[PDB]
Design brief:
The structure is cut from a larger assembly and holds five copies of chain A. With 48 residues, chain A is α+β, with helices and mostly antiparallel strands. Helix content of chain A is 33%, strand content 8%. Chain A is built from two helices and two strands, in the order βαβα. A two-stranded antiparallel sheet of chain A has the order 1-2. Chain A is globular and about 35 Å long. The interface between D and E is medium-sized, with 33 and 24 residues. Chains A, E: This is Major capsid protein. Chains A, E: Belongs to the herpesviridae major capsid protein family. Chains A, E: It is found in: Virion; Host nucleus.
Chain lengths: 48, 49, 49, 49, 48
């Protein structure tokens, strides 16, 4: 799986998170957020 | 990898796990998941339709 | 795909994007009819979902 | 292990701890419980109709 | 006893939490959670 969001709102909700927010999954109404099983986006890009 | 888009969730068992977070403005377009915002190799968002 | 497809199961946990998870590591080695029964057959449900 | 399913909690004493973290539509399926969800030895939701 | 839920909304809350994710068992009207007495799910499967 890779992170996906029906709307930018939930994407901003996890963008605010300092670490580990991408691993969680959330489903508001018919909108949903697939979790990222491997937080490489949290690290491999941010690790620099 | 793979990313779903367009999946519906049942209304009879639909729910709100994050009422405390976002407060979406009501619109029929926000109900059906026509699009799935994603990512790029650089951090960003990548819309698809 | 079906719009009704479950997301909380099939898409959150890793699985074969075929819609029916299967492995030769799970199927008995050196087999054909019961091995193809593990995959393309439907009367015998696969593992995972 | 054991897990009940289909139990009817009393209506006169019905309550809601932690209301802020969840919200539900007023569909009948959200009212009367029917099908439990569980997990496999690898974690994943596991419905039991 | 082990984990039990009715609506997915309760399962998403028990999953979103970190340490002690199954330490408690919330009730919501007719829906209810039943947390496991032994946290084999929280750590054992993941710990290896």
């Amino acid at each position: 799986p890779i992170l996906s969001t029906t709307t930018l709102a939930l994407m901003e909700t996890k963008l605010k998170g300092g670490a580990g927010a991408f691993a969680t999954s959330e489903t508001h109404f018919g909108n949903y957020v697939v979790g990222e099983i491997i937080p490489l986006q949290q690290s491999m890009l941010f690790n620099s | 990898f793979f990313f779903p888009v367009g999946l519906y969730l049942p209304e009879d068992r639909g729910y709100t796990t994050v009422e405390s977070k976002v407060k979406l403005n009501d619109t029929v377009r926000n109900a059906l998941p026509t699009t799935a915002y994603l990512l790029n190799r650089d951090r960003a968002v990548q819309k698809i339709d | 795909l079906t719009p009704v497809t479950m997301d909380v199961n099939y898409f959150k946990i890793p699985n074969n994007p075929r819609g029916r998870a299967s492995c030769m590591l799970a199927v008995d080695p050196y087999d054909t009819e019961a091995a193809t029964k593990a995959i393309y057959d439907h009367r015998e449900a696969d593992a995972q979902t």
